[PDB]
Structure formats: structure tokens, C-alpha cells
Design a protein around this nucleic acid. Structure first.
Lengths: 153, 46, 64, 91, 42, 369, 200, 121, 59
RNA sequence: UGCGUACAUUCCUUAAUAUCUGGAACGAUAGAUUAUGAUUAGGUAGUGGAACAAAAAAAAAAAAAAAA
RNA sequence: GAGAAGGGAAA
RNA sequence: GGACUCCUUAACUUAAACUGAGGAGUCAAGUAGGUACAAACCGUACAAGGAUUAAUUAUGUCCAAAAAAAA
RNA sequence: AGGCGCGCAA
RNA sequence: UUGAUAUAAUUAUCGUACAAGCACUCAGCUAGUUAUUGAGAGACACUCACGAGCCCAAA
RNA sequence: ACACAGUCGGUACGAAGUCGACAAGGUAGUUGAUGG
């Protein structure tokens, strides 16, 4: 989520909805007890809020900077382990968004400068070279051909 | 099928919210009431 | 596997006979395993110390 | 882990037992062939090829006594289930 | 279907890099009425 | 009635292998078998007694009912004819100057097009035959543009001791002009992977295969450079440029968007559907460093902890503070094991090398198929 | 003792002369045997039913100051070749460096363990090839022939005049070491693998 | 079903007529669309490669050095720039591409040991 | 569950069968409704997912 | 004397259940996922393993960090 | 230079 | 109680994608390439999955259509 | 009440 | 737009066929059910309990 | 739509300015390579 030499962080907010009683939130509560404070300390630029909902499935909502329409994401945390929850958190921390529009492959190089020496253009010498076919050649006939009568003579 | 999928989606949308009313629940009212009774069951005699 | 500290270690090290030699590879592998054990013990001690410090911090916070 | 149910005719990718061979290459009807336990084709059933054996089925009818091994009797005596100081009876 | 040619030997145009001005359409800006004001064309 | 075996061959010698046609084991056996048997003892030992033929084997050959399924063994297809390109020449590089002095091309904001007319005219001509320091550098480029042949330098792609990167003797002292070329006038070709090449300048954003155990904000260096170029010169490596590297910063360690993969064959009930998201690393190119006095990358470092190499994450400094140290400052466990990498490329894979180097590169060290 | 093998070289239809090479069978038994058998032709016909023989084979690549490569017994152009054991055989040992002129080594394709009939002779030291190609022998006589072969090369690898091995066979100090060999524990002896392959 | 119903209806977005909303027709159309994608994603690499090859050939012929000779010269010189990179240099770095062509010519056009001057005899 | 299916005689018991392993790319795709980007891509995003500018740099 | 062309378990991500892939190993308060380990993973009929199928019932929906 | 026997048309 | 190509055969009008035998290869149940165009011929380091790198397979190198003729 | 099994060794 | 590229699907069939059969489209209904009874027999059949013993019908 | 109607790709800002910009110019911000 870093840009401008690591000075702009795209993941801004994380809101974790959990149940204080449900067994499907046991991993989330374990994460709160043991790991949440360390994660916040190592990621001070993210605002983490915890909201309790007793009879609803646990989930995490991630909000990023910008208005690209990929800055809102939601991920259910039902029955995940603390390590898996941390893995999802790190994924979203390292992303600029949910990346609907990010494509694997393509040119793989985005640039503001196509060329530093200038693009290729037709020139008079090149367009004259393109008409090489119309120039005449000198047939290399090699040694002369002699008639049997001349050889006999 | 489509009807079952729609009914399941609506039930998933409503069943997890406390304090609903009969007019809000519609055809799912008895199921919602039984679900809330089961959820309360743990509070009896604390 | 340490779930409380979120630390999972699985060493899959290979000391190849073609690279080192049968006996030399064996010796290096044994030394590798011994060092891993020592580091694990030291890490356990450090984790206990850090946990005690965390309890101290929580008690100090609750003091307020 | 228990056994998963294997209901048939619920899609091509299910691991339930197939239906295509049953539909195409199997005889139609309740019994998938003649209603019998002996049929093997036009040839005679094995039992009808073989001759009758009256001794075999009279041996079963013979009334038999309950066998007891002297090794079992010895084990019971050693463990004390029967007293050797008195006549050991069927009771 | 296939033919006398080769199915996979037909080049397709594509960009060897990406950039932000792919879809920037061309449009006409207002043009000077007084090119006599410029010294080069005074 | 007897079928007589065919003796002479039409093509190549037959070879049988187990299993259906596929990509399979190809490495030749560690110890081969000599085709010729030098002794009667070797000739008798050649027989494989597990294949001793019997009338039961003959009956299996001649049976009327279905025989063994044919897909268990097959005829090996014809050998291929790989080109033996190795040994390859001594790695090296060449620097050539093509400075264009025309005012129409030296415009500050940059002409959208290169001067091909100048390129062709100059080619034909050559074939047919602090302010004061900056002014001196301008004079040097002026001299070179008058005589571009005087600026041609060939050097070694591998270290040569006191000569650094020079084929014979140290590189010319004037080669420092390459350092003063701006990032907006520099471009290079570099590898971000084993077989991926990018043409990059400063400020570019490149997608690469997942760099293991790196996070957003980390600094990385790519050391495999095959071509560098400005508007005045070009350095072509054979195959790499030793004194060039690319600094980059990781901006993302993410998954690309969803992709649907569906295949099917009609009237055969055969189909596969799958949704996939692929791991990618986005890297911002910070600068392209070119330095004729560049030093060879230091060997792989010896970590103070081995557990991190096989853990799901690096240990945090609070955990690292509990490392027992010797009087000299080294960890106590170093005596048990120094920490040298067991293989080649493990530390580079984990991101502990001075830079990422892949194989065109004389200085890389990793496994290849 | 170490085998001695002769290659007779013709340059453009002229008999250039004879080069004698000593093979390192003691340290490289497999590679030395392969080269000796290819020189003598004893192993007979091969996969394509052509002799496993160096007789009438060209040097398809010559780079002056670097090396000359030959031994392609299928095509003579660099895309063919085969060893006596099969198409390819495993790299044996990188004991010696390419430390001087006149050393014999095995050419290879891109993939590892692609040693075949194709070999090359060094025109000088090639330290950058150490650990990647196997040095298995060295010239003992024929330096003038090697110089004449070098005279026909170009930087691009083209040869000014064809260079061929018109005869070859067997006749009836060492380069610097990459490391110092030492005795190793070998629990399973060599013959056991062969007996297993035959089924014991 | 071969593909999930929701995925089918999401893929048939933008199609013509009943194919957008009728499951029976949308299924067939989506099957064909994704099969075409699967085949063409495997095929497109060589279609891009031939484009690179043609661009390089034109660039070299501009300097009187066809692609065949250029490729032999580079590979012999131990220059292992790939086809995409060479095409990019051709279309965006003409000076560097010309330098590459000159290096290739320097190796291809070797000279025989003895040269003959027959202009005045 | 374990790192891989165990086939040896020691683990041929129904107590060792079943279970699901976790992989982040697969988790991010399972149980999520699929959403195409065909008619939803912003004009500020290239078709490769990179920045795209709607106006010339001069205002 | 060349070059074009189909094939990547080179890179990255998954999977292996009719007793023989290292694993009869390393862990173990219930397996975190093997970084140059191997075999590998087209498939009709047939056979087998696994993951879902949002529901209902059950007398286990608050000993859970910080905030309130 | 050839079922070059898909179309054009080449030494 | 299958199809076609190949080798060797009996029947046929030394006919038929004809009929009937003995063996290999493909299809059947195997995609993408060549062979002009809907199985059976050639070729494959045969298709778990993703990607804008690479290789002399068959077979090509005037154009449709990728690929040589400096001075 | 009844059912199955009950070493062939020592 | 333009370039390249591609002979709906399903079933039987040697045969990847709209000159073969069904289907305008869509909603709901719509087809391997069950051994207080059978079983692991070289084409596949798990799992607990007690053990030279094991089970316990009607009531 | 040429299209079982889909699939892979798919335009690269400004100088549109101007009190502009090595060796020659006959001053065009024009020009240097080329006799059988």
C-alpha cells in the first residue's frame, strides 16, 4: 500500500465485526487477546475498530484512500484461525485495494516515458531503401561456357 | 432452485438481527421467533 | 507451531553428498539441527520474558 | 469420518454410482434378467449338472451332541470352574 | 476452421508497455485569430 | 504361418518406456551401462532372469481374450536435436557513443521523434571514413561526437582483480561521464525474474512474480542488467552489464483480479471450471545506478538466526533482543554452526542477498533445469 | 595407463596433421571411455544406425583465442551427437579447471547433463567455464596442428576453410585442480547397482 | 451445471437479446465465451511473438541487416536480449537498436585472410 | 488434516481422513459472489489496472 | 553460411485415500502449507476419495484484549 | 519450380 | 458383438469407408500445430492453473502469411 | 428361552 | 469501427453430424427409497465394544 | 455486424510553443550519404 517512497499508505481503516459469544468468533477473540495490539503497533497508520454483534457472522471491512471504486472490501472471518486472520490483514495492508482491475500479465511495465531517444519515424533514406528491389544487379555467370566443337578444335 | 436461493438469501439477511417485528419478518416470523427463543434459552436461571 | 506468538517453523534443509561429501554433509546436518534446537530454547525464554513484561504493562494501565 | 451418501442421478461430476451403463447396456425390467437365483444361461445350472448327494443332506438332519475339548475342560478345572473332588456332571 | 495458412502465424498489434494516455481522445482547442502578434510571424 | 521378426530398421532403434506419453524423467542414470561386454562373465550377467521366458508367458502372448491394457507401455518417440551452444564466450560488454549535436534534436523538452536522418548520415559517414567541470564534460561529449570511435570501450563481465571491469588494464578515467546522465535520460533492460525482462527508466511501475517474504515499502536491487542507454551512448552487455543496477521499492504484495478458466469438450461430459487469483509484486523503479567503479556484490550474509529462514515470518526486534551473544558480539550458536547457506539461491529467494541476480549473469548463483 | 588417442586433421582437403591426446581414465573413467570408444569406433552403430565414430566429422565452430568445437557425428553442425551410453550421459566430475591451451572438454546444450559426442579443445585458459564443463584429457603432441586449426577461425565461429577429422583412433603436467579430492564413505559398492538393474 | 448460474449471468452481461437473461441460452453462450478465452489465452503468446519478429525484421532491413543475420550475430556475440526487448528497442530506442545492428554486423561480416585488389589489372 | 494425504499403512484409518487446508488465494475466491469488471472500470484505470489520465497534463 | 515454427511442474499458485513417495520421518492442546525432495495431475464406461447443499432439532450464544 | 491440384502470380 | 492407416493374407470384377482373418498405430475415451475445410495421416519435453520468456517437431522460407542474400 | 463361535497346537 | 480467431448444446453411435430424436422462453412439481432383514467371497466395501467367548427375543 | 453474435488485443498528452536552437549557411530554426 506504499507509494511516494513509502510515505503514502493506501489502507486507511479496518472495521472488524465479531460476536462475543459465538464459537465461530473464537479465533477472532484469540486474535484480540494475543495479537491485535502487536499488529496495531507495527501498523500505526491503520485505524482498527472493533464492533460487537452477537448473532451475526464475523467479518472485516477494509477502507482505502482514493475514489477508484476498489477502495471498499469486505471479507468474512467465520471459523478462521488467528494466523489466517492475520494473513488476510497483511494482504489488505500490502494492497492498494481489493484489486478488481489488476491484471496478471500484459506489458508488465507502466511508464510516463515511452522513449528517451524518440520514436521511430519514416525518413527519406529509409523510404528509399525500401525500394531496393528496383535496382539492377550484375549476374555472376562465373566461368564461360564452351561448345564441344570449340573444345575439340 | 431460484425460489430456494432467494428465500435462503432473505433469511440470511434478517435472521441475525435482534428486535425485529412480525411485519418485518413476514413468512419467516415463526422461524425467527423460535430462533430467538433458542438464543434466550441460555439465560434461564442464568 | 506457536499460535499465541503466530510463529510456525518447518525446516526442510538438505546437505547433499554431491555438494559436500557423505560424512561432511552428515556432520553439517547434525550441527544445523543442534543450532536450531538451541535457538528454539532461547526464543522460548525470550517469549516468557516478553509475556511477563506484557502482563506488567497491562497491570500498570489498569492502575490508571 | 463417516461415509458420505452416494445418491445417484445428481449430476455428471458426482462420485455416486453411474447410471449410463444401467440405462443403455442393461436389460430393462424389475429383475434385469430371468426372475431366478439359478439361471446361468441356456446351460444347466451347476447344481443340476452335479448329481444328488443324499448323505450330505442326511448328515445335516442327524441329531448331534455338543462337543467339548479336553483342553477346555482342563482349563476350566485349573481356573476352578469345576471341582475335581466330586463327579463333574453335565449340569 | 483452419486453412492453407498457419493459424498461429498472424501477428496481432499490441503495446509493449503501458501508459496513462491510451484513451485520451483528440479534440480541437480554440485557435488564435491574430498569428500576426507572434514575432516569428510578425 | 510363422511371423518372422523384422531385423533391419526403418528410422531409429526402438525404445520402450512405462506409462502414457507425457513429460517424464530425463536425467541420465548416474552410472551408465557400457554397450559392449568385454568378457563371457559380463555376457552371461547381461541376462535379466526376471524376464526368463516360459510357456506361461507364451500363453499370455497367444491368449484369445483381452490382453494387458496397451496404455501401460509405449514406444518412445524420436530423439530431439538440441543445439550445443555451450561453451559460451567470455562474458563482456561494449559501450558505444551516438551523440547527436543537432539543435533540432538537442531541444530541452525532447522531440517526440528520433533523428533517423542523422542516424543514417552518421552511419554512412563513419563507414566511409562545478561549472567549469561541467563544461569539460560537455567538451568530452563534443570530442566523442566528432570521433565516436574514440569512446568505444570493451570490458569484462566478470571481476578481473585490480582491473575491475576492464578486459586489459583499468577502465579509462573519463568513463565517469556515465554517472552524470540524468534519470530522465536513462533507460535500461533488467530481469525481475529468471526469464522476464523489462525496459525501465526512473518512475516506472513493473509487475513481477511474487518476491518471497517481502512487504510493501521494502527496498530491493536488481543486478541483472543487459543493456543501458542514454540519448548519447549505449552499453550492451555480453550478456550483462556488470556496473549497472536498478533500485526499486515494493509498492504491493497482492493478488490480481479474478480470472475464470473454463474448458470443455462437447458430447463427452468433459469440463473443468476454476476461479483463480494470482500473486504479483508491484515495484516502483527509483533509479538506475551506473558506476564504472562499482564493487562486486558481497557474498551472501550469515544470518544471526536460522529459524527465520524456515518460519512464516521474520522475528520482531523484541524477539531478536533475546539472542545470547559472545564476548566478541557474535551469537553463541555460531560456534555450533556458522550459518553458511546450505545451497545456492536459498538466501536470494528469501531476500537476504545484496541484490536479485538471475541467469544470464556471471555473478548469479542458483539452480537451473 | 592413461589411453592415448590420435585425431588426424585435414584443413580444406589438405592433410594438416596428427594430434595426440592423453585421456584421464583414472579420474574420469566414464568420459574417457566415451571419448576413446568414439575415437576407435568399436561400439558400432547407434540410435540412427550410423557409426559411433569421429572419422569424417567436421569442426563446426572455431573461435580464435577461445576454442574449437567438434564431434557432432549426426549432422556436423552442432545440433546432433550421441554418446556410447545413449543420447546423453551425466556430468562426471569438475576436478580440473580450463587452465591452459590444449585441454579437452565436453560441449553441452542448454539443459544440464547433456554431455554427448560433442567436445571442444581450448585455445587458451577459460576460467569462466570452471564448474560447468568437464575437462577429461589434454594434448600431448600436435600443437602445430592446433595452431593451424586456430588460423581458420573467426570471432563469430565461422571457419574460413573446412576443418575435418579424416582419421581417428587409439595408439597401443595436468591442469590445475578446482579442489583437492579426498576419500569418501561409499556404503554401496559399484557392482550392486548393476546387479540390481539386472535383477540380482 | 458446468458453470455456476450466477457466474453465467455475470459473464453474459453485454450480450444480445435473450442470451442476457434466459438461463438456457445464456449457459451455451457463456460456455462458448469462456472456452474461446481458454484457447486464445494459450494461443496468444506466439501471435505476439510473430509481431515482435516482424518488427525486428523491418528494423534490421532498414539498416540492410535482415532478422536472420541479426539473430545469428547476437546469439554468437552472447547477446541474449529477447524478441520483445529487441522490438521495443526498434520502435522506441533507434540509436540503441542501430548500435546493436552495428555490433551484429561486426561479427557477421568477417573478412578472409587474403584480400585481392583487381581494380586495375 | 496434514501437509499431504498419507497413504502408508500406519494412517489407513478413517480418523485421518477429511479436512480442508488454507490457501489465501483460494480463500479470497471461495464463497464470494463473482463480479465482472466489463462495464464497471473507471476511466482513470487502464485495462491493465494502472493509472489512466482523463486530461492533458496542461489543465 | 541462416532463420521461421508446437511443447516450461525455468517463475508463481494448488491437488494426490483400493494400505510402498521420503513419512515406521519431524510436531502434537486436536498438523502451517516440504524454500533445487520424488512421481507426477488429457480422459468416455466403471470404480473410488473429498468439499458443498444458507434449513431444522439439541436443554452450552459472555471466564476473552481496549472502549463503553 | 513441386497434387504449386486453395487464390494471386514469380525464376 | 467397433472405425480408419500400415504390413501379410482369403473372398470380390486382383471393385468398393465391401466382407472376413493375424499384428502395430491413432480414434473410440486425447485439446491447441501441420496436412485447404467435421475422428482414424504427421508431430508433441500430450492440456492441474496463471503469465507480453526460450527451444529447430512435423514442415517452410515471392504475396495472402512468420522466416537470408553487406561491400 | 434361544443364536453364533469354541485352538488340532501344547 | 478496424486486425486476428472460433462448425450451439444433449443422447445414442465406429463416426466432434440441426438432411437423426427433444426442446419459443420462464416459474413451480418432477426420477437409486428403505435391510428393527444382508454383507465384504483375489475389480476393491469402513468403525466402536467385549473377547474364548459374544449377543439377550417375547414379557 | 463479414461473425452460434463471442474471444485476444485495441488509439500513447504538450511544439497547437517561439522575445526559438559539431561543422556550413548565402539565413530556409535550411543543410552534411551518393559517379557508371
Amino acid at each position: 500500500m506504499a507509494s511516494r517512497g513509502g510515505t503514502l499508505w493506501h489502507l486507511k481503516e479496518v472495521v472488524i465485526q465479531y460476536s462475543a459469544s459465538g464459537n465461530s468468533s473464537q479465533g477472532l477473540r484469540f486474535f484480540f487477546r494475543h495479537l491485535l495490539h502487536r499488529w496495531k503497533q507495527r501498523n500505526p497508520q491503520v485505524q482498527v475498530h472493533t464492533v460487537e454483534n452477537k448473532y451475526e457472522a464475523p467479518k472485516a471491512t477494509f477502507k482505502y484512500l482514493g475514489e477508484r471504486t476498489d477502495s471498499r472490501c469486505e471479507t468474512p472471518l467465520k471459523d478462521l484461525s488467528p494466523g489466517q486472520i492475520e494473513q488476510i490483514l497483511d494482504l489488505h495492508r500490502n494492497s492498494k485495494g481489493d484489486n478488481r482491475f489488476l491484471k496478471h500479465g500484459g506489458p508488465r511495465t507502466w511508464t510516463e516515458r515511452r522513449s528517451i531517444q524518440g520514436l521511430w519515424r519514416p525518413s527519406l533514406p529509409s523510404q528509399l531503401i525500401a525500394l531496393k528491389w528496383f535496382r539492377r544487379k550484375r549476374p555472376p555467370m562465373r566461368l564461360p561456357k564452351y561448345s564441344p566443337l570449340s573444345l575439340s578444335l | 432452485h431460484t425460489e430456494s436461493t432467494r428465500r435462503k438469501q432473505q433469511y440470511a439477511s434478517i435472521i441475525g438481527k435482534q428486535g425485529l417485528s412480525k411485519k418485518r419478518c413476514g413468512i419467516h416470523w415463526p422461524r425467527y421467533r423460535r430462533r430467538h427463543k433458542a438464543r434466550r434459552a441460555t439465560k434461564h436461571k442464568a | 507451531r506457536n499460535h499465541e506468538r503466530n510463529f510456525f517453523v518447518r525446516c526442510e534443509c538438505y546437505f547433499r553428498v554431491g555438494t559436500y561429501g557423505f560424512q561432511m554433509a552428515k556432520d553439517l546436518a547434525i550441527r544445523y539441527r543442534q543450532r536450531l534446537e538451541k535457538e528454539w530454547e532461547e526464543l522460548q525464554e525470550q517469549w516468557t520474558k516478553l509475556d511477563i513484561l506484557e502482563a506488567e504493562q497491562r497491570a500498570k494501565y489498569k492502575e490508571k | 469420518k463417516r461415509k458420505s451418501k452416494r445418491r445417484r442421478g445428481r449430476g455428471d461430476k458426482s462420485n455416486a454410482k453411474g447410471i449410463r451403463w444401467k440405462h443403455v447396456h442393461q436389460q430393462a425390467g424389475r429383475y434385469k434378467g430371468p426372475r431366478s437365483r439359478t439361471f446361468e444361461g441356456g446351460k444347466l445350472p451347476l447344481y443340476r449338472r452335479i448329481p444328488k448327494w443324499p448323505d450330505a443332506w442326511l448328515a445335516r438332519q442327524r441329531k448331534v451332541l455338543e462337543p467339548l475339548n479336553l483342553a477346555k475342560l482342563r482349563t476350566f478345572i485349573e481356573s476352578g470352574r469345576l471341582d475335581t473332588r466330586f463327579t463333574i456332571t453335565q449340569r | 476452421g483452419g486453412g492453407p495458412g498457419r493459424a498461429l502465424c498472424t501477428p496481432t498489434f499490441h503495446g509493449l508497455s503501458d501508459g496513462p494516455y491510451r484513451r485520451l481522445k483528440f479534440s480541437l482547442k480554440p485557435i488564435r485569430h491574430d498569428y500576426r502578434d507572434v514575432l516569428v510571424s510578425a | 504361418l510363422q511371423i518372422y521378426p523384422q531385423r533391419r530398421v526403418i528410422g531409429h532403434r526402438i525404445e520402450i518406456f512405462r506409462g502414457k506419453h507425457r513429460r517424464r524423467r530425463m536425467v541420465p542414470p548416474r552410472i551408465p551401462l557400457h554397450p559392449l561386454a568385454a568378457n563371457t562373465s559380463e555376457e552371461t550377467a547381461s541376462k535379466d532372469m526376471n524376464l526368463f521366458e516360459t510357456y506361461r508367458d507364451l500363453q499370455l502372448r497367444w491368449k484369445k481374450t483381452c490382453r494387458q491394457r496397451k496404455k501401460k507401455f509405449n514406444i518412445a518417440r524420436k530423439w530431439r536435436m538440441p543445439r550445443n551452444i555451450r561453451p559460451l564466450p567470455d562474458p563482456s560488454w561494449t559501450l558505444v557513443f551516438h551523440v547527436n549535436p543537432r539543435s533540432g534534436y538537442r531541444r530541452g523538452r525532447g522531440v517526440c521523434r528520433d533523428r533517423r536522418r542523422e542516424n543514417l548520415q552518421g552511419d554512412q559517414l563513419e563507414v566511409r571514413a562545478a561549472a567549469l567541470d561541467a563544461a569539460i564534460e560537455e567538451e568530452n561529449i563534443l570530442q566523442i561526437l566528432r570521433h565516436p570511435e574514440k569512446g568505444r570501450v570493451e570490458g569484462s563481465g566478470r571481476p578481473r582483480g585490480a582491473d575491475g571491469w576492464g578486459r586489459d588494464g583499468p577502465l579509462p578515467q573519463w568513463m565517469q561521464i556515465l554517472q552524470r546522465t540524468p534519470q530522465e535520460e536513462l533507460f535500461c533492460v533488467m530481469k525481475s525474474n529468471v526469464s522476464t525482462q523489462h525496459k525501465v527508466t526512473a518512475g516506472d511501475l513493473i509487475q513481477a512474480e511474487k518476491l518471497h517474504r517481502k512487504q510493501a515499502g521494502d527496498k530491493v536491487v536488481f543486478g541483472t542488467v543487459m543493456l543501458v542507454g542514454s540519448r548519447d551512448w549505449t552499453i550492451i552487455g555480453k550478456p550483462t552489464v556488470p556496473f549497472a543496477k536498478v533500485e526499486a521499492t515494493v509498492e504491493e504484495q497482492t493478488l490480481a483480479g479474478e480470472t475464470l478458466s473454463f474448458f470443455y469438450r462437447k458430447s463427452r461430459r468433459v469440463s473443468r471450471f476454476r476461479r483463480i487469483r494470482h500473486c504479483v509484486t508491484m515495484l516502483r523503479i527509483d533509479r538506475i545506478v551506473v558506476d564504472p567503479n562499482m564493487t562486486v556484490d558481497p557474498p551472501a550474509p550469515k544470518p544471526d538466526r536460522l529459524l527465520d529462514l524456515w518460519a512464516n515470518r521474520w522475528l520482531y526486534p523484541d524477539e531478536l533482543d533475546g539472542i545470547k551473544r559472545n564476548e566478541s558480539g557474535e551469537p553463541v550458536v555460531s560456534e555450533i554452526y556458522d550459518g553458511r547457506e546450505h545451497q545456492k539461491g536459498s538466501y536470494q529467494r528469501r531476500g537476504l542477498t545484496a541484490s536479485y541476480r538471475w541467469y544470464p549473469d556471471p555473478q548469479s548463483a542458483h539452480w537451473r533445469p | 595407463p592413461n589411453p592415448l588417442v590420435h585425431l588426424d586433421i585435414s584443413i580444406g582437403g589438405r592433410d594438416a596433421g596428427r594430434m595426440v591426446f592423453q585421456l584421464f581414465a583414472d579420474t574420469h573413467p566414464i568420459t574417457a571411455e566415451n571419448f576413446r570408444c568414439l575415437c576407435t569406433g568399436e561400439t558400432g552403430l547407434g540410435y540412427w544406425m550410423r557409426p559411433r565414430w569421429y572419422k569424417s566429422t567436421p569442426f563446426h565452430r572455431i573461435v580464435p583465442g577461445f576454442m574449437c568445437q567438434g564431434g557432432d557425428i549426426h549432422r556436423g553442425d552442432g545440433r546432433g551427437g550421441e554418446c556410447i551410453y545413449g543420447q546423453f550421459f551425466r556430468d562426471e566430475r569438475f576436478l580440473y579447471k580450463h587452465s591452459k591451451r590444449g585441454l579437452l572438454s565436453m560441449a553441452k546444450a542448454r539443459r544440464q547433463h547433456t554431455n554427448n559426442s560433442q567436445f571442444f579443445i581450448t585455445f587458451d585458459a577459460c576460467p569462466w567455464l570452471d564448474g560447468e564443463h568437464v575437462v577429461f584429457g589434454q594434448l600431448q603432441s600436435g600443437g602445430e596442428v592446433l595452431d593451424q586449426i586456430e588460423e581458420q577461425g573467426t570471432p563469430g565461429g565461422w571457419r574460413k576453410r573446412p576443418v575435418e577429422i579424416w582419421n581417428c583412433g587409439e595408439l597401443l603436467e595436468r591442469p590445475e585442480k578446482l579442489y583437492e579430492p579426498s576419500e569418501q564413505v561409499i556404503p554401496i559398492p559399484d557392482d550392486v547397482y548393476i546387479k540390481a538393474r539386472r535383477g540380482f | 451445471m458446468q458453470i455456476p448460474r450466477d457466474v453465467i449471468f455475470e459473464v453474459v452481461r453485454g450480450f444480445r437479446g435473450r442470451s442476457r437473461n434466459c438461463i438456457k441460452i445464456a449457459r451455451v453462450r457463456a460456455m462458448k465465451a469462456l472456452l474461446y478465452s481458454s484457447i486464445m489465452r494459450r494461443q496468444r503468446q506466439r501471435r505476439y511473438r510473430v509481431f515482435w519478429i516482424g518488427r525486428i525484421n523491418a528494423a534490421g532491413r532498414e539498416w540492410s541487416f535482415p532478422y536472420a543475420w541479426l539473430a545469428t550475430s547476437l546469439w554468437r556475440q552472447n547477446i541474449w536480449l529477447d524478441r520483445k526487448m529487441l522490438a521495443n528497442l526498434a520502435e522506441t530506442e533507434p540509436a540503441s537498436f542501430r548500435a546493436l545492428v552495428n555490433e551484429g554486423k561486426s561479427v557477421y561480416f568477417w573478412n578472409p585472410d587474403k584480400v585481392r585488389d583487381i581494380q586495375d589489372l | 488434516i496434514a501437509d499431504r494425504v498419507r497413504t502408508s499403512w500406519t494412517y489407513r484409518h478413517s480418523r485421518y481422513s477429511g479436512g480442508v487446508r488454507f490457501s489465501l488465494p483460494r480463500f479470497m475466491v471461495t464463497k464470494r459472489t463473482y463480479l465482472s469488471t466489463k462495464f464497471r472500470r473507471p476511466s482513470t484505470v487502464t485495462k491493465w489496472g494502472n493509472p489512466q489520465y482523463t486530461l492533458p497534463s496542461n489543465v
